[PDB]
């Protein structure tokens, strides 16, 4: 019963376009295909704008005021968005592919590189209300005979330098009166001109070409005219200049070469500050910080992004996304970390809070089909098409064990015992489930009985029963543990594609090729509910299709399903353009999400294969924090969260309940009532007010007297609040009071408080413990130094 909104995209950090530093220098804007991701370098946080383009983004720029961001796609369609509020402002079409966009340093005007034509337009006022037709063109310039490679603004907002494919750099005057001041075309380059820049004093102009030559231009007598006083050359053996940037204040030239290496130079002396290689792929984009200490690099081929502090020779950011689509995803049991698997065969570990890749594994030769954690969470297991199942420690980041069949059986699904001692994997060719011993690595036995390939597997977290599904049109429940072995087959109407296990372990859901989600009672093996999905799914006609989408039967089934940890919801995904969230007890659709709207993706709307990328979702899972769910898709890992909570979703209001009324109860020292009243209103700001205003002395009194119904909610609030809050001791006092007073009730109903209490454990473990670990060693380190005898 919660509202999920797209928050961020993990697994992809840069796809193409120009990266730009925020004016404050603390944030980096990386264009990610159809959207743009913003990274908080200082706070080490990341998020993605919700607004999206029709086609992959081409260019972006943010104003020095930091209020406006412009994004233009390959079709020239421009989207204007308020940076601060993250809301779209206006939609416009410039009707031509815009190579680059740059705001004037004043911010009043911005320039667009359109073919061989330069356009200068006026910036709308953010303060003014929404305008129907805000954009007005200041001027258009037609000097170049070929496409404009790039453009550079003067520091005074009076001149703009453009480098075009005519082997010519051409300067302009923003003011018509100042046309005589700057109406020069600079020639001499032997190859395409990449970048023209102004000196800080602006007397000197530096021009750079793809061949790797830098010309220094000065206005001097031979009466006065521009001349090439000095010439420099990049003597790269074969690498060609791909991107160039200049920082006039500190005189830095950062150049990315096509070989995949960049050089840092000091002008005009041409001193090579440093040279480094980020790989064999070309360096596509380079941007420089406002202060000039941080230099960011982007290569599209492997989707690489790196932020470099050349001052200290340190890496602020070093992140690279999957080359292939993410085949599967799995959250850490606490939800702090998520692991992703791609068709390449490489596994990457991501942190939810930071949104950054901590480590990557390359051991698997072929595509990794599935990934899963043990109940304890220290260990992660994976199965790949190469014919191996590999066990990974996430504390020490090592593959401590590998499992394989006798004949190198291809594995497509995997499941792990809650005890973390038995593993079961399934194959699309062998029809039999292989079982290994985690401790020993030997094949215990093979669970046979399926007349079809085993599509998916799962262990009950509590009962430890195994449920297996296939294209056999049946489900089999295996009681592997115990002196006696048994199999319980249940028949289903159609081929099974996906299976999810109830955290209680009493029910199982299965998705069939007919487009049905059927739920069965494990202990009895009878159906308990059935949900339709065929109508709800949205599938777009492919460009190659010769048959209509409505008549199409390509994908009206969900290839991945999972429950909510509370146990009342299912999120389902498949080879389609939709994510559907259902409400299990009564079989209805809660909400539906459009995974993508990129026109490039095929499903959005005799010698050669007509294959083009298509929108599809490989896997879906809920957050153990019960506030988000993530879906693996072609573009990357989409995460939808309920964090913002702008909705007013009260519980048990009465006329007496009012935000104003609550405050007197605080003023009237009636803390218990104020807390209960605030929860009834269910407003975070009011709850936070009451929570922080309760004195420490009265906490045990309030905790003992809280009604049972509000106990799960308050516990969830503290856990979610504490993980980022600074009042650990205040929070830790609250949990001690709550656990001491109501712990017995929690034990009586473990499932009701499962999600909330897990968040509490995360706070106690992932931050609180680290504090004492740093505190305790200092104490012992202290004692040794004082107690130990000093050296001779």
């Amino acid at each position: 019963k919660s509202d999920f909104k797209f928050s961020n995209l993990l697994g992809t950090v840069y796809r193409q376009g120009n990266i730009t530093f925020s004016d404050d220098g603390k944030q980096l804007l990386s264009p990610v295909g159809n959207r743009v991701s913003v990274f908080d370098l200082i706070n080490n946080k990341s998020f993605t704008f919700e607004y999206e383009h029709r086609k992959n983004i081409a260019a972006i720029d943010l104003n020095k005021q930091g209020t406006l961001l412009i994004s233009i796609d390959e079709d020239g369609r421009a989207i204007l968005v308020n940076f601060k509020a993250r809301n779209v402002l206006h939609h416009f079409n410039f009707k031509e592919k815009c190579s680059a966009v740059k705001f004037s340093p004043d911010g009043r005007l911005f320039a667009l590189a359109s073919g061989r034509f330069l356009q200068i337009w006026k910036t709308p006022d953010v303060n003014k209300d929404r305008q129907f037709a805000p954009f007005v063109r200041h001027r258009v310039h037609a000097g170049h005979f070929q496409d404009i490679t790039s453009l550079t603004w003067s520091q005074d907002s009076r001149f703009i330098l453009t480098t075009s494919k005519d082997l010519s750099a051409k300067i302009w005057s923003v003011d018509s009166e100042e046309k005589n001041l700057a109406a020069t075309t600079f020639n001499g380059h032997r190859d395409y001109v990449m970048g023209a820049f102004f000196s800080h004093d602006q007397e000197k102009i530096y021009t750079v070409s793809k061949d790797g030559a830098v010309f220094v231009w000065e206005f001097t007598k031979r009466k006065y005219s521009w001349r090439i006083t000095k010439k420099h050359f990049f003597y790269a053996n074969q690498a060609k200049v791909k991107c160039v940037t200049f920082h006039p204040a500190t005189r830095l030239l950062a150049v990315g070469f096509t070989s995949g290496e960049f050089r840092l130079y000091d002008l005009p002396d041409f001193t090579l500050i440093q040279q480094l290689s980020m790989g064999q792929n070309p360096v596509n984009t380079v941007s420089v910080n406002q202060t000039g200490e941080w230099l960011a690099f982007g290569s599209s081929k492997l989707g690489q992004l790196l932020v470099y502090e050349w001052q200290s020779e340190s890496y602020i950011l070093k992140q690279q996304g999957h080359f292939d689509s993410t085949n599967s995803l799995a959250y850490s049991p606490d939800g702090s970390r998520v692991v992703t698997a791609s068709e390449d065969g490489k596994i990457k570990v991501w942190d939810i809070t930071s949104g950054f890749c901590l480590a990557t594994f390359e051991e698997h030769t072929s595509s990794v089909t599935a990934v899963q954690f043990a109940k304890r969470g220290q260990v992660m297991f994976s199965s790949s098409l190469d014919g191996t199942v590999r066990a990974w420690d996430l504390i020490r980041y090592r593959n401590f064990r590998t499992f394989t069949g006798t004949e190198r059986i291809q594995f497509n699904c995997l499941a792990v015992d809650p005890s973390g001692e038995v593993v079961c994997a399934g194959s699309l060719d062998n029809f039999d489930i292989h079982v290994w011993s985690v401790q020993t690595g030997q094949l215990l036995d093979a669970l046979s009985g399926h007349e079809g390939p085993v599509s998916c597997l799962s262990f009950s977290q509590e009962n430890s029963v195994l449920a297996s599904a296939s294209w056999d049109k049946t489900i089999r429940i295996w009681s592997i543990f115990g002196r006696s072995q048994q199999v319980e087959p249940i028949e289903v109407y159609s081929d099974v594609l996906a299976l999810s296990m109830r955290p209680d372990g009493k029910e199982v859901a299965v998705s069939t090729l007919k487009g049905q989600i059927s739920i069965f009672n494990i202990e009895d093996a009878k159906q308990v509910g059935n949900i339709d999905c065929r109508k709800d799914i949205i599938s777009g006609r492919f460009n190659q299709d010769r048959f209509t989408a409505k008549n199409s039967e390509r994908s009206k089934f969900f290839t991945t399903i999972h429950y909510s940890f509370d146990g009342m919801a299912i999120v389902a995904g498949g080879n389609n353009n939709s994510i559907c969230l259902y409400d299990v007890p009564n079989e209805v659709l809660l909400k539906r999400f459009i995974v993508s709207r990129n026109m490039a993706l095929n499903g959005t709307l005799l010698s050669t294969r007509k294959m083009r990328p298509e929108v599809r979702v490989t896997s879906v899972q809920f957050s153990p924090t019960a506030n988000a769910f993530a879906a693996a898709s072609t573009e990357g890992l989409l995460i939808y969260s309920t964090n913002d909570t702008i909705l007013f979703d009260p519980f048990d209001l009465d006329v007496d309940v009012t935000p104003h009324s609550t405050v007197e109860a605080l003023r009237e020292k009636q803390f218990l009532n104020a807390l209960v009243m605030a929860f009834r209103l269910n407003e975070e700001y009011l709850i936070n007010k009451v929570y922080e205003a309760i004195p420490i002395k009265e906490i045990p009194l309030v905790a003992s007297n809280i009604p049972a119904i509000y106990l799960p909610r308050i516990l969830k609030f503290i856990g979610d609040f504490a993980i980022e809050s600074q009042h650990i001791e205040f929070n830790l006092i609250w949990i001690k009071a709550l656990l001491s007073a109501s712990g017995g009730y929690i034990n009586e109903h473990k499932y009701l408080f499962s999600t909330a209490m897990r968040s509490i454990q995360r706070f106690i473990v992932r931050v609180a413990k680290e504090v004492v670990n740093t505190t305790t060693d200092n104490k012992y380190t202290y004692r040794f130094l004082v107690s130990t005898d000093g050296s001779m």
Binding site: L181, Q202, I205, F219
Partner: peptide, 16 residues
């Protein structure tokens, strides 16, 4: 100057 414009030597020989 461009129209677009805005608006001791210590010896190295030493005693050891």
């Amino acid at each position: 100057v461009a129209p677009t414009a805005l608006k001791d030597d210590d010896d190295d020989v030493l005693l050891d």
